[PDB]
Design a protein around this ligand. Structure first.
Ligand SMILES: [Cl-]
Ligand SMILES: [Mg+2]
Lengths: 195, 240, 235, 250, 243, 244, 111, 241, 231
């Protein structure tokens, strides 16, 4: 599984997600994109059990896209996060629960504010200035508790994020093969190609 | 469960419930589809016995099934919502399993199949709806226009109309549409569509809706003034 | 009213007999079987000139070795074709072989009487099923909504059927070549059709052991139409 | 076998009437008169006990029924239909309210549940509507005293006072002259007995009349002591003797 | 009117015309009888020989339920078989739960309730048979006759079919002439005579006789068919009486 | 069998109309008139009670106007019992949406689902349709103030001003005459009462034969308030406009 | 706890020539250290010139052979007495076995 | 007029199928009667065996529902037995569920509720029977409760049912006008049976042999039917007074 | 008239018209004959075509190695009923290692047809069947009618003009019953029997269908050039 991080700054939400897919003693892929665009201004990164992750992500994607076409309207990040939470809260008491942890980064166009939601497989939702899933938080949170300001720019956020990846690449046991970084703001979703 | 076979054959070999569903379509407001060289235009009549309407919130006559395909109809409005919903769900399901949006032919084939199913299932009546389905296949620039009807038959059309007085507007399109040279631009296609509706409508005020679909999910609905300019221009050329 | 599965005093099922009237209103479809292959041809019959005729699909593939033509309420045929394709592919999965044409036809005909108070009414469409297998060679079957199927050397269904069938009675012999059969379908279709026959309002197809089931191009059929007109003028 | 009647037996006629509901109301019109009057400190519901035979024991047939300790019901129309509705009404007060909130439903909501049951018999497959109109009287802490009428359609209306059945037209007119917003419970009982005498033909005594009140809490009818908050049922059925006492000063 | 078009509908008389119409189908059928005797019951039936091509002895009509009950019926033969199949299911479940073989009165009500159930709904048709049945249980011999309505009673003698009145008259004479009781072997002979006498009402086609019996002493309380010497002896007794 | 007694409630006439829907609309045309008027700063709901008796309890009564949630209300015309079945479904549906998305349900979404339920009863199941027409009045942050109507067919449409029930033809003509877009709530209140007063089948319009409600942003700052009028408040508003 | 499987021992062997094929098997049947039978055949002629053996747990072995023999019978009924080729038999037996993938026939099958 | 074929309302608010089921009640042409003593409840019914080929011991319209409850039926035997089997099953289940014997009035209500359902539900016809339940209830004492195809039920001081029910009813009314009490003031059930037969003879105007009658008696903790000789013993006692 | 809308309705004289109408479909069917000796049982069937371009509708169906039938009426109904017989024969073999008695086969068909004549919604089967077989009690011939009535016979015929063959077999009874240990002669008698039901048409090579089962003969069907011997 692995490193999914999220930082909400003044005007945007930044998601960083590891590129490795490891099975057994082999790294099968080093360019995996652990994210799905749910709507033009809403991105979801995911991590957990093999198969479950993509299956859940795409299922949520299909539902939000269906809603968009039906109402000719984009759901708010808060609304999408609540829908996702409920689906996971249902799942946890099913015969076979989805073992998937997600971060949802969105830009609310009605409020003109970035929003980051952390939701685990149990359906535990929180809104946070910065978030992480798995062992990643054990490293990066103290770093973010120190350096994070609520009025940071997107560039300042990316530098703050570089600091986190560097710490993880130093102290983490596994080679997670770097991260794919994506920014969510007023203009939508774009990928940083050189990280 | 209610089981009654409502759609059945008569001695002469007709299924009257299917044929009466076509009469409901004939009562509905006129709808027209015209495809150009690089676009499809869907035009729709709106009856004017209803003043004091709120057009912001009133259900529009042309519905997006996906970002690249649209559906208009003639007949029972309530019935059409059920077909539109099912079509929208199948659109997302196709993207999920095939990893590619639906072709216009496929989406039409699905909608037509649903309609057919309601003609030989117990306890249900046929849909009192005929549809015009238009759009562009993924990564394709060839315009697509299809028509479905209550029986379940579907087919492709260079241009077609359905609803009340559709036989009058079909007559117009049959002599005004050249297969060898379809409307080369967006303007030409919208005009031929507006012209065809003006044979039947009344005033070109808040009675005509026009929606233009271009390749790669490029769909936009025209406003009153934009349509009114076509109405104004056509009438001045007519006085000759 | 009355039950959907009711018998008439003459010992026939009302709904089945009435569906046969619906099929008589349908567009003409003809099939001819030879030792070189089976030919399937249909009248497209567009209701209006604005309708793009190549979207009219009344000849259909079931498998590589089996093809099908239809007449009547053609919307009713979709689920019949869907079943036929699944039956053909499923048999290949279970037995690693091609399914016999007769076995396919029997499977489709099993759906037919599954109506009552199962679906609410019989199918309003007749099918011509043509194919090849190693045991019985080239075969043509006529599948009805009664659940009955006959093998035919040649057969016409639809509005122009009784006139076309009488013509097929005179023309068919056991030594017809594939080319001879192609021309014969075109000739007889041109006779019973309302509008003048051309490549846009009529469609040809065949099934051969070597190349399987093929729907002909409008270009290929047009040349066979031209070859036919020239031969009739030549005596 | 099996219920093949999965379709509606009540449908709209071209004029817009729902035939079976209209015909059910006609059955209610033929029914014996029953009434209800709301006072400031209570409610009274009353009806005639039409005996089928003098060999029958009319005490064994109760037209006025307790639904909850604070709610009672009376009817006009078909007795059997009423009996099963009372069974269903008593149960639904528990299943859809008491088993959830640990207290009895307020009058308006229990009435709402009975109305639902009667509405469904108007739309569901293979059933006719109920051939009764109900009068339900009750009390609850936040609404005080109330009186409701429920019809075969499932519609219900609140009343200060009303009558249903045989001589309802005359009885309603009588109640309009006598009803004011300052009536005390005893005054309402007096008027109830006066109104009922007009529609009753034969014997008029405590054995031919059935009458119950919704009034003060009755600790003596609770059956136990020790819980201060439990103070007893407000529903009380007047005895044959209690009715005759009031028929002398009539 | 129209009250007779649907089963379970009461007419203004308080009648179910559909059941009365099923009775007409029973009256059309061949004659069958039942005779109660000292320690058992005897059943007999008329089998019309439609053609020379019918294999003799090989279209058996009397049916056994469990090992101690015999059933015969007149009317729609398939309807009778359906009733016996149910009877066999009822008897099996009784023996399953309670161990002892089903008593005859108990068995009678099982068929009765089942036939009565087919008068409660318009989605089923009443049975087109009257069934004569019985056997031996712990309380001795019992003979019953069940009708399309579900109505059944215990009988000293029973008859149904086209020659029921002829057979009934002949049965009443036996009851009057034998107040103490009739023996099993005698009842077999009498059954043959009565079927031959009841055949006068169906005398175009000649017939084949079929008899069965349950007796505490003669068959050990089990149902058996009468065959061979005992059958021919009973046929001869009947032939002598018609002449 | 039972085929004999089946009315076939979900079939087409030879003209392509649904018999039962048409007949349900005929039923609704005899119900008390209800009017909805949408202003720029709020919505008015006005409805006439069906011929009242003097002994009817007027204050503790509800017949025409029902609350679906804090932001949406409906005016009813038709069978009240049928309406309550649908109202409870609508109330639940609103709460399902709020539970799922943590946002109050958009008005159209609620209207569509309720209209879809009506549609179903006209296509399958062999049951009679609901004999009810609704006027929906509500607010959400997407479209602001909205008026809708639905009828037994399951067809719904949006309005600036609309009437259902009795005398809709006359009522609509009167609304079409005096309505304008820049109208305020207090003006709409007057129009609603004036229209009922002229279309009523009664002798004179009084407080005891009316139900009245407003949906304003006339609370304190950027929030919506539902005011179901009390009897005395209807008496006062009837005097204030000089009808009595 | 009840164990639905057992082991009946024995061994089987198939060899193919140019115009022939043999399928051999010993006739011993066992449980644990006891002999159940010295002659209990487990190689069977299934019709259409197909011989089959399913060796391991004999109850499963017999059940499978029984089902395949029945499959040959219905193949004739459904496809105009057509001969079931060995390759078609093989594919059919795969589906018989995989149909019980989560409660397997405890056998090694050779045709 | 299909409103006369199934249990839906007619324009005048009537249920014709229920009304016609009431007429089926008299199809057997048998009259029944029930009275109460101090300690007992006696029910009597006519027994008509027309066919000589019938086994007279199997012809009965009185049923032992439970140890304490008896039931006499007025109506065709198939419907009668249908009602009896259900009543037996209901009484047995009540005892198992609630730990005490089902009271006569409660069984009457339950069977009346079932009958009500057939008047409201279309697929089920009413049973063409009237059911009279009798017992000596441990709380209420001697009890008579009667059910009909409308689903109506009520308790009785005494009752009668059949074609000539009105004659028997008024005969009983006139006795209770005279006696001024709710029951037969008698110690033994034997004399209450004698009263029942005596007043049936007076009302119907016919004499009875031992095979023309059928008698059921309910006492504390058991209901039982009388044999032909028990009735004969009873007939002799009446004649010798 | 008013009582033929469904199978659940009796007429005032106690008739079931839907069952009688189903019986009528058999009468329109092509003639088929059945006969037996003590060693063999034989079916002979006249096949019917749509026209000269069509095949001849197959009338005979195999049910087991020892049993099979011929049909007259609705062919799909014969397919349903024959399939049921195939299953019942098969159940008897798998569960009891027992060949299904031809008599039980008759009882099972009777009960299956009956259920379709007493319930709402269903319809009677519209086909008649002649079942032949050889079991533990020798050769057998049965006649099935969709009323439910099954009958065991030495010989019979059903279909259009079946009365001719039925009369012939009634005359020939004493002769053909003793054709033991001679298949070709028993067939010859059946072919002569079906010839009494022919009008304007005669027995050709793709017209005649013969089936035989017996002591040392599995149920086998003969068509085409294999029946040329008998013309
Ligand atoms: Cl109950
Ligand atoms: Mg009923």
């Amino acid at each position: 599984m692995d490193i999914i991080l999220g930082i909400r700054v003044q005007d945007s939400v930044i998601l960083a997600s590891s590129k490795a897919v490891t099975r057994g003693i082999s790294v099968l892929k080093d360019s995996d994109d652990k994210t799905r665009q749910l709507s033009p201004h809403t991105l979801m990164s995911f991590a957990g059990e093999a198969g479950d992750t993509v299956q859940f992500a795409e299922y949520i994607q299909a539902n939000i896209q269906l809603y968009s076409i039906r109402e000719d309207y984009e759901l708010s990040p808060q609304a999408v996060s609540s829908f996702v939470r409920q689906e996971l809260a249902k799942s946890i008491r099913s015969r076979r629960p989805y073992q998937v942890n997600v971060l949802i980064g969105g830009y609310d166009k009605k409020k003109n504010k970035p929003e980051l939601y952390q939701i685990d497989y149990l359906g535990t939702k929180v809104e946070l200035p910065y978030g992480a899933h798995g062992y990643s938080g054990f490293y990066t949170f103290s770093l973010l508790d120190h350096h994070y300001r609520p009025d940071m720019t997107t560039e300042e956020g990316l530098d703050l994020l570089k600091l986190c990846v560097q710490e993880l690449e130093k102290r983490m046991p596994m080679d997670f093969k770097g991260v794919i970084v994506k920014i969510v703001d007023k203009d939508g979703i774009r990928q940083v190609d050189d990280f | 469960g209610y089981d009654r076979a409502l759609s059945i054959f008569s001695p002469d070999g007709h299924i009257f419930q299917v044929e009466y569903a076509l009469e409901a379509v004939k009562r509905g407001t006129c709808a027209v589809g015209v495809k150009g060289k690089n676009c499809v235009v869907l035009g729709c009549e709106r009856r004017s016995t209803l003043k004091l309407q709120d057009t912001r919130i009133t259900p529009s006559k042309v519905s997006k099934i996906d970002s690249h395909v649209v559906l208009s109809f003639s007949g029972l409005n309530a019935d059409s919502r059920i077909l539109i919903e099912k079509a929208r769900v199948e659109a997302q399901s196709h993207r999920l399993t095939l990893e590619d949006p639906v072709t216009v032919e496929y989406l039409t084939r699905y909608v037509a199949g649903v309609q057919q199913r309601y003609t030989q299932s117990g306890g249900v009546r046929p849909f009192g709806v005929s549809t015009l389905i238009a759009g562009f296949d993924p990564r394709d620039d060839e315009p697509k226009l299809y028509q479905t009807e209550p029986s379940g038959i579907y087919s492709s059309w260079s241009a077609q109309t359905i609803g009340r007085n559709s036989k009058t507007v079909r007559e117009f399109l049959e002599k005004n549409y050249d297969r060898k040279e379809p409307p080369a631009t967006v303007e030409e296609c919208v005009k031929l569509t507006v012209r065809s509706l003006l044979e039947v409508v009344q005033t070109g005020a808040k009675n005509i809706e026009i929606t233009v679909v271009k390749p790669d999910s490029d769909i936009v609905a025209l406003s009153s003034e934009e349509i009114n300019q076509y109405v104004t221009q056509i009438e001045q050329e007519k006085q000759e | 009213d009355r039950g959907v599965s009711t018998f008439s005093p003459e010992g026939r099922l009302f709904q089945v007999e009435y569906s046969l009237e619906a099929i008589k209103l349908g567009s003409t479809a003809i099939g001819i079987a030879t030792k070189e292959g089976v030919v399937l041809g249909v009248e497209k019959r567009a209701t209006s000139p604005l309708l793009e005729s190549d979207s009219i699909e009344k000849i259909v593939e079931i498998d590589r070795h089996i093809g099908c033509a239809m007449s009547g309420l053609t919307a009713d045929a979709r689920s019949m074709i869907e079943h036929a394709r699944t039956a053909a592919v499923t048999h290949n999965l279970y037995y690693d072989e091609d399914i016999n044409v007769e076995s396919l036809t029997q499977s489709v005909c099993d759906l037919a009487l599954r109506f009552g108070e199962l679906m609410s009414r019989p199918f309003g469409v007749a099918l011509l099923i043509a194919g090849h297998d190693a045991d019985d060679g080239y075969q043509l079957f006529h599948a009805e909504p009664s659940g009955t199927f006959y093998r035919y050397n040649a057969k016409a269904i639809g509005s122009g059927s009784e006139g076309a069938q009488a013509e097929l009675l005179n023309e068919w012999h056991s030594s017809l070549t594939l080319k001879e059969a192609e021309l014969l379908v075109l000739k007889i279709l041109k006779q019973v059709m309302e509008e003048k026959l051309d490549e846009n309002n009529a469609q040809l197809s065949c099934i051969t052991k070597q190349d399987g089931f093929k729907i002909y191009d409008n270009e290929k059929t047009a040349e066979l139409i031209k070859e036919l007109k020239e031969k009739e003028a030549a005596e | 076998m099996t219920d093949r009647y999965s379709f509606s037996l009540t449908t709209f006629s071209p004029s817009g009437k729902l035939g079976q509901i209209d015909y059910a109301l006609t059955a209610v019109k033929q029914g014996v008169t029953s009434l209800g009057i709301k006072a400031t400190n209570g409610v009274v519901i009353a009806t005639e006990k039409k005996s089928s035979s003098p060999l029958a024991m009319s005490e064994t047939l109760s037209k006025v029924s307790l639904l909850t300790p604070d709610i009672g019901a009376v009817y006009s129309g078909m007795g059997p239909d009423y009996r099963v509705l009372v069974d269903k009404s008593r149960k639904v007060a528990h299943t859809s309210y008491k088993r959830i909130y640990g207290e009895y439903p307020p009058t308006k909501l229990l009435v709402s549940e009975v109305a639902k049951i009667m509405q469904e018999a108007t739309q569901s497959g293979g059933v006719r509507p109920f051939g009764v109109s109900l009068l339900i009287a009750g009390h609850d802490e936040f609404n005080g005293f109330s009186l409701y009428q429920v019809d075969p359609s499932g519609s219900y209306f609140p009343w200060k006072a009303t009558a249903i059945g045989k001589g309802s037209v005359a009885a309603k007119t009588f109640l309009e002259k006598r009803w004011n917003d300052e009536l005390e419970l005893e005054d309402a009982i007096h008027i109830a007995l006066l109104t009922l005498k007009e529609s009753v033909e034969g014997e008029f005594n405590g054995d031919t009349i059935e009458l119950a009140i919704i009034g003060d809490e009755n600790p003596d009818l609770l059956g136990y002591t020790g819980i201060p908050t439990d103070k007893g049922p407000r529903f009380r059925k007047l005895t044959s003797q209690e009715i005759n006492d009031r028929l002398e000063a009539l | 009117t129209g009250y007779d078009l649907s089963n379970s509908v009461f007419s203004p008389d308080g009648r179910n015309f559909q059941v009365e119409y099923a009775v007409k189908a029973v009256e059309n059928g061949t004659t069958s009888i039942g005779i109660k005797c000292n320690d058992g019951v005897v059943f007999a039936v008329e089998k019309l020989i439609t053609s020379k091509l019918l294999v003799p002895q090989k279209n058996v009509k009397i049916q056994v339920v469990d090992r101690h009950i015999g059933c015969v019926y007149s009317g729609l033969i398939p309807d009778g078989r359906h009733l016996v199949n149910r009877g066999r299911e009822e008897a099996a479940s009784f023996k399953k739960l309670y161990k002892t073989p089903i008593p005859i009165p108990a068995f009678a009500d099982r068929l009765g309730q089942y036939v009565q159930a087919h008068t409660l709904y318009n989605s089923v048709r009443p049975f087109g048979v009257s069934t004569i049945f019985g056997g031996v249980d712990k309380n001795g011999a019992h003979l019953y006759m069940l009708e399309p309505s579900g109505s059944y009673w215990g009988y000293k003698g029973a008859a149904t079919g086209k020659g029921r009145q002829s057979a009934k008259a002949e049965l009443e004479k036996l009851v009057d002439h034998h107040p103490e009781g009739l023996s099993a072997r005698e009842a077999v002979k009498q059954a043959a005579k009565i079927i031959y006498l009841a055949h006068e009402d169906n005398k175009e086609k000649d017939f084949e006789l079929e008899i069965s019996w349950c007796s505490l002493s003669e068959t050990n309380g089990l149902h058996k068919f009468v065959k061979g010497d005992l059958l021919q002896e009973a046929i001869d007794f009947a032939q002598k009486e018609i002449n | 069998g039972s085929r004999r007694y089946d009315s076939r409630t979900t079939i087409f006439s030879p003209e392509g109309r649904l018999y039962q829907v048409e007949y349900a609309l005929e039923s609704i045309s005899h119900a008390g008139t209800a009017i909805g008027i949408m202003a720029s700063d709020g919505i008015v709901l006005a409805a006439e009670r069906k011929v009242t008796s003097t002994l009817l309890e007027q204050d503790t009564s509800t017949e025409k106007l029902y609350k679906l949630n804090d932001k949406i209300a409906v005016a009813v015309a038709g069978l009240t019992a049928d309406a309550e079945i649908l109202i409870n479904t609508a109330r639940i549906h609103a709460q399902n949406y709020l539970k799922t998305y943590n946002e109050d349900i958009p008005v159209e979404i609620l209207v569509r689902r309720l209209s879809d339920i009506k549609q179903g009863y006209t296509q399958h199941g062999g049951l009679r349709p609901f004999g009810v027409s609704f006027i929906y009045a509500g607010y959400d942050d997407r479209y602001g103030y909205q008026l809708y109507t639905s009828n037994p067919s399951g067809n719904y449409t949006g309005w600036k001003a609309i009437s259902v029930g009795a005398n809709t033809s006359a009522a609509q003509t009167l609304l079409q005459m005096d309505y304008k877009d820049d109208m305020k709530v207090d003006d709409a209140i007057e129009l609603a009462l004036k229209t009922l007063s002229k279309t009523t089948d009664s002798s004179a319009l009084t407080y005891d034969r009316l139900e009245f409600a407003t949906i304003r942003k006339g609370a304190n700052d950027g929030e919506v308030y539902q005011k179901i009028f009390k009897p005395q408040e209807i008496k006062d508003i009837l005097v204030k406009t000089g009808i009595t | 706890q009840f164990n639905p499987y057992g082991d009946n021992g024995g061994t089987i062997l198939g060899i193919a020539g140019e115009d022939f094929a043999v399928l051999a098997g010993d006739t011993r049947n066992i449980t644990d250290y006891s002999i159940n039978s010295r002659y209990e055949p487990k190689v069977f002629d299934c019709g259409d010139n197909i011989v089959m053996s399913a060796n391991g747990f004999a109850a499963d072995g017999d059940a499978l052979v029984k089902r395949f023999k029945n499959s040959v019978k219905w193949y004739h009924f459904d496809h105009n007495d057509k001969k079931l080729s060995i390759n078609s038999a093989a594919r059919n037996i795969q589906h018989l076995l995989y149909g019980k993938r989560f409660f397997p026939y405890y056998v090694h099958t050779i045709i | 007029g299909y409103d006369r074929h199934i249990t839906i309302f007619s324009p005048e608010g009537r249920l014709y199928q229920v009304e016609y089921a009431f007429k089926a009640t008299n199809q057997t042409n048998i009259n029944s009667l029930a009275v109460r003593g101090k300690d007992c409840t006696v029910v009597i019914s006519q027994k008509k065996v027309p066919d000589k080929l019938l086994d007279p011991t199997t012809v009965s319209y009185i049923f032992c529902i439970s140890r304490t409850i008896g039931m006499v039926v007025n109506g065709p035997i198939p419907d009668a037995r249908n009602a009896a089997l259900r009543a037996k099953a209901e009484a047995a289940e009540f005892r198992y569920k609630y730990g005490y014997d089902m009271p006569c009035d409660v069984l009457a209500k339950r069977m009346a509720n079932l009958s009500q359902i057939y008047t409201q539900r279309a697929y089920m016809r009413p049973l063409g029977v009237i059911l009279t339940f009798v017992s000596v209830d441990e709380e209420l004492g001697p009890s008579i409760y009667k059910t009909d195809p409308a689903g109506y039920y009520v308790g009785y001081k005494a009752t009668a049912t059949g074609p000539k029910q009105q004659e028997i009813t008024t005969n009983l009314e006139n006795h209770f006008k005279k006696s001024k009490i709710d029951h037969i003031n008698e110690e033994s059930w034997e004399k209450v049976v004698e009263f029942a037969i005596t007043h049936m003879i007076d009302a119907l105007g016919t004499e009875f042999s031992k095979n023309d009658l059928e008698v059921g008696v309910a006492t504390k903790d058991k209901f039982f039917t009388l044999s032909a000789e028990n009735i004969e013993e009873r007939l002799v006692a009446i004649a010798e007074q | 008239n008013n009582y033929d809308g469904d199978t659940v309705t009796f007429s005032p004289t106690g008739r079931l018209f839907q069952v009688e109408y189903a019986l009528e479909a058999i009468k329109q069917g092509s003639v088929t004959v059945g006969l037996r000796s003590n060693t063999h049982a034989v079916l002979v069937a006249l096949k019917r075509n749509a026209d000269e371009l069509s095949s001849y509708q197959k009338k005979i169906i195999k049910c087991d190695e020892h049993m099979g039938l011929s049909l007259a009426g609705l062919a799909p109904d014969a397919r349903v009923l024959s399939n049921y017989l195939r299953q019942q024969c098969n159940y008897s073999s798998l569960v009891f290692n027992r060949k299904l008695a031809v008599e039980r086969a008759g009882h099972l068909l009777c009960d299956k047809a009956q259920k379709n004549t007493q319930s709402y919604g269903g319809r009677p089967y519209g086909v008649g069947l002649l079942i032949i077989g050889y079991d533990k009690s020798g050769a057998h011939l049965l006649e099935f009618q969709p009323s439910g009535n099954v009958t065991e016979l030495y010989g019979t015929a059903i279909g259009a003009r079946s009365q001719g063959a039925k009369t012939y077999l009634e005359r020939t009874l004493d002769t053909f019953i003793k054709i033991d240990g001679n298949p070709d002669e028993l067939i010859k008698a059946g072919v002569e029997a079906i010839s009494q039901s022919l009008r304007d048409e005669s027995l050709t090579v793709d017209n005649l269908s013969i089936a035989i089962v017996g002591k040392d003969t599995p149920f086998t069907i003969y068509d085409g050039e294999a029946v040329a011997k008998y013309i």
